[PDB]
């Protein structure tokens, strides 16, 4: 089998190391460590911000894992995707803290009072995480933000609070006072780059797949599909997606009776979770850019290899041109076509020296659509 340990691919797996998150984990340690060792002398609070898949939840889980046996605090994890209103959240806090509810229906204030009484009378210390807190109404978020400041009612600073959002809107939608408590304890998780995605995936492959079933080039292909090139490219950089594609590709290969992941397993897996290549964006390419994309498609079909060289594509492109009765454009022109296809997300390139891959669309179907379009233009 290719897949030797599938738990290494589930959402809940917490890897041994978190490459590229050493800084955020350190920051968290700095905000929380003293209080976890000796709680109740000040109110620790942080806000973790970053797009989906930038390691916010995993980083926080790793922090807990390091302190789990070295603290009296209770880790009360609240997934804001699931528990959104006051009643749902206080109920999950109460369950996590074993606080029995009364027979009578309680008001919002009664509930908070009950939670304060239990924290105080049982001398408890809660590390409360409100994950994906953009899901809550701002008034709920403020209630919990303000609770940790009430040391005289609590008896100590009994609450350390981490809240998690995608961007600054989770804080900006708070009233000014409330915003005052959390601002400047902000830890930012930027979209992962291609190289960082690769390092994450290599760890997963080493832990979860058979030795020799995956190559560095295959992981690089998936990282080229998912990693952010520049940090403002916030629609990429998602490690969840990258790991999901790796696992889907390993399984596709295995189910087909193969021992090694091939480029087509990645393309098909990528298309199940991502937008593939738009026919609309193909139609608009100039003729020779279509022919050059057809050429890259033909070389990659022949190579069975994630990447082909620019020289390969150009030799393929001369053959393609003569088939379709066209004279081939010159090297520098092909170079600009490659630049444009890369800018549009149609192809991915990496330096060796230039390597080209098509990771987002199965080649048999791309090849058919591009051929159709060329045939129509040359009809
Ligand atoms: N730096 C990393 N190293 C290893 N695995 C990571 C890293 N960052 C994220 N992951 C994995 O990527 C996936 C998404 O991470 P996650 O913490 O769930 O993201 P977020 O809350 O930012 O949306 C999970 O499977 C997580 O374990
Ligand atoms: Mg998360």
Automatic annotation (TrEMBL):
Gene3D superfamilies: 1.10.8.60, P-loop containing nucleotide triphosphate hydrolases, Winged helix-like DNA-binding domain superfamily/Winged helix DNA-binding domain. Mg(2+) binds at residues 57, 131. The keyword Nucleotide-binding applies. ATP binds at residues 54-58, 192, 204. Keywords: ATP-binding, Cell cycle, Cell division, DNA replication, Metal-binding, Nucleotide-binding. ADP binds at residues 19, 53-58, 192, 204. Residues 42-193 form the AAA+ ATPase domain. Residues 293-369 form the Cdc6 C-terminal domain. It comes from the Archaea. SUPFAM superfamilies: P-loop containing nucleoside triphosphate hydrolases, Winged helix' DNA-binding domain. The keyword ATP-binding applies. GO terms for biological process: cell division; DNA replication. One of its GO terms (molecular function) is ATP hydrolysis activity. HAMAP family: ORC1_type_DNA_replic_protein. Involved in regulation of DNA replication. Belongs to the CDC6/cdc18 family. This is ORC1-type DNA replication protein. It comes from Pyrobaculum aerophilum (strain ATCC 51768 / DSM 7523 / JCM 9630 / CIP 104966 / NBRC 100827 / IM2).
């Amino acid at each position: 089998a290719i897949v030797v340990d599938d738990s290494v691919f589930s959402p809940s797996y917490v890897p041994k190391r978190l490459p590229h998150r050493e800084q955020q984990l350190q920051q968290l340690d700095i905000l929380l460590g003293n209080w976890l060792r000796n709680p109740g002398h000040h109110y620790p609070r942080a806000t973790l911000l970053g797009r989906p898949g930038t390691g916010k939840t995993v980083t926080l889980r790793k922090l807990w894992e390091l302190y789990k046996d070295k603290t009296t605090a209770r880790f009360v994890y609240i997934n804001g995707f699931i528990y959104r209103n006051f009643t749902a959240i206080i109920g999950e806090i109460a369950r996590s803290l074993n606080i029995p509810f009364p027979r009578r229906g309680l008001s919002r204030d009664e509930f908070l009072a009950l939670l304060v009484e239990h924290l105080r009378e049982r001398d408890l210390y809660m590390f409360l995480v409100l994950d994906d807190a953009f899901n809550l109404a701002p008034d709920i978020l403020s209630t919990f933000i303000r609770l940790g400041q009430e040391a005289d009612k609590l008896g100590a600073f009994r609450i350390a609070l981490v809240i998690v959002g995608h961007n600054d809107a989770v804080l900006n939608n708070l009233d000014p006072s409330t915003r005052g408590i959390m601002g400047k304890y902000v830890i930012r998780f930027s979209p992962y780059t291609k190289d960082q995605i690769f390092d994450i995936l290599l760890d997963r492959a080493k832990a979860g797949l058979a030795e020799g079933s995956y190559s560095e080039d295959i992981l690089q292909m998936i990282a080229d599909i998912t990693g952010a090139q520049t940090p403002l490219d916030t629609n990429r950089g998602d490690a969840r997606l990258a790991i999901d594609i790796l696992y889907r590709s390993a399984y596709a290969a295995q189910q087909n009776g193969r021992k090694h992941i091939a480029p087509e397993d990645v393309r098909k897996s990528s298309k199940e979770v991502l937008f593939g290549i738009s026919e609309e964006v193909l139609i608009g390419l100039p003729l020779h850019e279509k022919l050059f994309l057809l050429a890259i498609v033909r070389s990659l079909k022949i190579s069975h290899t994630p990447y082909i060289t620019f020289g390969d594509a150009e030799e393929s492109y001369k053959i393609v041109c003569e088939e379709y009765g066209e004279r081939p454009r010159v090297h520098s022109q092909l170079w600009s076509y490659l630049n444009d296809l890369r800018e549009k997300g149609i192809v991915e390139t990496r330096q060796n020296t230039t390597l080209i891959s098509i990771g987002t669309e199965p080649l048999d179907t791309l090849e058919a659509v591009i051929t159709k379009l060329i045939k129509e233009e040359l009809r």
